[model samples]
Target: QEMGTYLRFIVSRMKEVDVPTIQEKVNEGKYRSYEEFKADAQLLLHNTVIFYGADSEQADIARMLYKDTCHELDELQLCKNCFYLSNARPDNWFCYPCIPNHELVWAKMKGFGFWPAKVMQKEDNQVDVRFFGHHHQRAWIPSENIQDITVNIHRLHVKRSMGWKKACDELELHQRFLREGRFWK
Candidate 1:
């Protein structure tokens, strides 16, 4: 569990340089390797070894490049299907994270045609759309594979809308889900 050393590697190598000056040198176009530029800047520092950037221009470019990499790494992470952390309590779980696929109802944006599609019971998170499309080909389409497109049951009648009364059910389950805070869970 202690992953300190992994992070320590980055921190230690970075701590040696004067960041503001490094930014200046890299952008100015000098050497460009961490140790190389630091070595070039050595002449200005103490006339010994400064590397990665020896320019104000090269320094600026390197600074921005490294900054962008930080954000790139943070956007998201991925994991095997089993890592979803289903039903796990908050603060005690880790997962690759997923966003429900919503296009399953009507793939091309048009509603179902001649034969209305059917959604089988969701198992382990996957719902099978036995479209009249239901060659149901792959046995059980994993939950991670289909989209729960219907945001509102009655309105768009997605996935499982028949459960609601069509005649005049005033409260939309979608609205209720949010009002009651069920979505937060």
Candidate 2:
């Protein structure tokens, strides 16, 4: 009776998809893209939740499995164009033309938070930066830690509002140290 329950109790949305069926499709190369898998997995999980009710243990387990799948997807770092994970040593390789060449960026600092910096030179995944208002104080920082100035304006505004006083105080002390010129010597 339990095996026949779905046939008689079905709603209009009786689309059946389970792991074994998905595995069969994968073997047949039926899945064309990451989004296809994502959507199918999402639908299966959503169906499970709906069938079991929100308070049921089955629904909870389905949610856990969904979280795990999403985590795995993020770590896969699939390429935007083809959804193929790169085998390159960089692991997160971007084509040359895709790299950001913005003259100004929000660069993370060692002592303070993110500050305005001028990009002096670019390497594979790093940027040589001269910090603004620090009298040509420069550092090589990883590009991953940098953000585009215009795109992250809201974040910059929020960050400066919260930490401007402390950041300024620390920066003034650092400037005094630079004036003495003993630390670099």
Candidate 3:
């Protein structure tokens, strides 16, 4: 899954910064291994954001604040939505029924920090989820219709789990910098 790749990438990148330094810190009780860090990260990454009472000014303000704060923190904040790829291959990735315009709009919104909440269905009854990448072009959208593909379905679940791991790694990195009084060097 893409998530797993992301996690491996994070861990590898972190290690590149100084594996011994990290290990020493861990030994000194500063933190734990990359895997442990990922476990905690998954919890926050998968935390759902449910919109409540669109008519409430307070809710609107809260949402705005959330978006602004996340942006300020250099975090990607996406609105829930779906995304599709033009070169999507049903046999290789999840394929769903969708209009070209819909996919275009979803992709554009995702680039602007909108999270995909659901997949659009095709005439053939295939389904795919809309998703945004943490970084541009880093997110994965299946090329096959995964609804009936057991392997793809399992991959989707794994991707979610991996995403959490990546989130955790970022959180840990942020905390480390914060504790050191550095915004990130």
Candidate 4:
């Protein structure tokens, strides 16, 4: 199966689900919260397509594309030692592990249509805004520590690649993990 065929199938399934109806329900507060909305939405989305079944060949191709994109982004974000950004606190900045050296990962993946880069902006003498390719961006003090700075940069990269949606989905799937403080898990 080809990429176009798979995409067509996905689009067709999406249409069948009436995605806009789900979106409307979510926005109208029919769901208690965003998590509830997503859980319901994902179920509908997955079920709508699962019955149709995906082509193994097309699935493999999609998986490869996803993996290649992830790998490339990982390299660009310098996330070999660190799986992803951990946290940035007022007094402390914690990076995944070794993000600075893995910066080239995104560049290698650019051929696949993933352009990852860092952009910085200085606003007045008080605030500095930094963007990390795809994930996340932040405004911070110029004197912020390296760990905090790197994490902020990586956040921009992840955001651009729709990683936030994945994070939200994972969190909704494992409420127990979240409540039990198993964030890394």
Highest lDDT scorer:
2
Off by over 4 Å in 1: 1-55, 77-185
User: Against the true structure, candidate 3 has what lDDT?
Assistant: 0.33
Could you estimate the TM-score for every candidate?
A: 0.19, 0.35, 0.18, 0.26
lDDT (Cα, tens digit) per residue for candidate 1, span 1-185 = 11222122222334444545654445554433445543433433432113445455655655554544332222212211112222222431221222341123322113431112234335675554433221212123445444444544344434433422321122233234335544323
Give a tens-digit lDDT track for model 4, residues 8-79. Answer: 222333342345665555445465543454455455535544655565554554445444433433332333
- lDDT per residue as tens, model 3, 45-161: 233223345456655554554343333222111211111222222221222222231232122132232222233333443333444234323234333323331122233333345
Q: What ordering of candidates by TM-score runs from best to worst?
A: 2, 4, 1, 3
User: RMSD in angstroms, all models?
Assistant: 17.3, 17.3, 19.5, 17.8
Model 4 root mean square deviation, Cα atoms: 17.8
Task: Kindly indicate the candidate among 2 and 3 with the higher lDDT.
Answer: 2
> Which ranges of candidate 2 are over 4 A from the true structure?
1-16, 78-185
lDDT of candidate model 2 versus the reference: 0.52
3 against 4, candidate with superior TM-score: 4
Off by over 4 Å in 3: 1-11, 16-18, 31-105, 109-185
Q: Clash totals for all models, in order?
A: 35, 0, 24, 18
